[PDB]
């Protein structure tokens, strides 16, 4: 009697890090994710692991464009 | 269900819009060739030029070039210098290349 199971991996702390209306500075990570659940919008970069981040100081805004996906924007201050 | 033409058009246009420049879009019909410089932030055309509108002549290529030149001139008159070339579904070649080269002689920055 024993189990062939027993393992699991570390949690990765994924998800949105800054929600709409939140003030951010350039470089602030906005979204941590696997693949493109949110796409980079206006003033937003995407790192190699899909991480969304602010390109300029400003305020975050989200946008749902239907079949085009959801978007994170940073609107300048 | 899209076509190679619809995909190609998207694929190049998306990459251009990402840079945030004013977009110099070119349409090339069997007979004519048109051009509008568009602000995608506002979804607005700022300057136009066409063989159709300039009642231009014969050799399509030479004509292209002329509309290119025409475009630039009305353009700098409005303070526009920089812009990004939207070859749309068209290879950068032939009439389009000619359109581009003329807009360049005309001083448009790209």
């Amino acid at each position: 009697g024993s189990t062939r199971n027993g393992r699991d991996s570390q949690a990765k702390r994924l998800g949105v890090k800054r929600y709409e209306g939140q003030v951010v500075r350039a470089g602030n990570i906005l979204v941590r994710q696997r693949g493109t659940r949110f796409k980079p919008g206006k003033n937003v970069g995407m790192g190699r692991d899909f991480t969304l981040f602010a390109l300029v100081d400003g305020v975050v805004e989200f946008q749902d464009r239907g079949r085009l996906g959801r978007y994170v924007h940073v609107r300048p201050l | 269900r899209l076509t190679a033409y619809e995909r190609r058009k998207f694929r190049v246009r998306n990459r251009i819009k990402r840079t945030g420049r004013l977009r110099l879009s070119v349409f090339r019909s069997l007979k004519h060739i048109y051009a509008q410089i568009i602000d995608d932030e506002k979804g607005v055309t700022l300057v136009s030029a066409s063989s159709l509108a300039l009642k231009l002549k014969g050799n399509k290529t030479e004509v292209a070039r002329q509309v290119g030149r025409a475009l630039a001139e009305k353009a700098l008159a409005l303070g526009i210098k920089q812009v990004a070339f939207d070859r749309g579904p068209y290879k950068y070649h032939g009439r389009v290349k000619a359109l581009a080269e003329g807009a360049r002689e005309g001083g448009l920055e790209f």
Binding site: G1, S2, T3, N5 | -
Partner: protein, 141 residues
């Protein structure tokens, strides 16, 4: 007797028996019905005993519709082992059944026959039951 031909997983976590049945609450095929009055895991063997008794009452004749299915695997640890060392072995299959469900229906048989078979069948099941007959309320669902 009834069991899945195949499954994505060998063992299921147990879950709960809260609420009235999700669906399956109106007569839908035959004339008379056996409805569950209280929740239970009904075992495959119990189901098969209800069925067999019903065909036994009919001798030849009637149609029995079984409307619940045992897809929940039931686990048990080997006798006398202590807690731990992983989940127990599947020993059988149950159908989760909540109050309101029509578990069985009969058709093609007299009224006194449908009543009796359903009663005897009831005695094979570990919950309280109600016999019902098809109404307009059934037909409007």
């Amino acid at each position: 007797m009834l069991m899945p031909r195949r499954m994505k997983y060998r063992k299921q976590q147990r879950g709960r028996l809260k609420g009235a049945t999700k669906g399956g609450d109106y007569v839908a095929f035959g004339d008379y019905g056996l409805v569950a009055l209280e929740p239970a895991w009904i075992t495959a063997q119990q189901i098969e005993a209800a069925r067999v008794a019903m065909v036994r009452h009919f001798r030849r004749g009637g149609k029995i519709f079984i409307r619940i299915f045992p897809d929940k695997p039931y686990t048990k640890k080997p006798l006398e082992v202590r807690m731990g060392k992983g989940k127990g072995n599947v020993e059988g299959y149950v159908a989760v059944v909540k109050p309101g469900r029509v578990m069985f229906e009969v058709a093609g048989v007299t009224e006194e026959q449908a009543m009796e078979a359903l009663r005897i069948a009831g005695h094979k099941l570990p919950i309280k039951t109600k016999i019902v007959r098809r109404d307009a309320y059934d037909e409007a669902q």
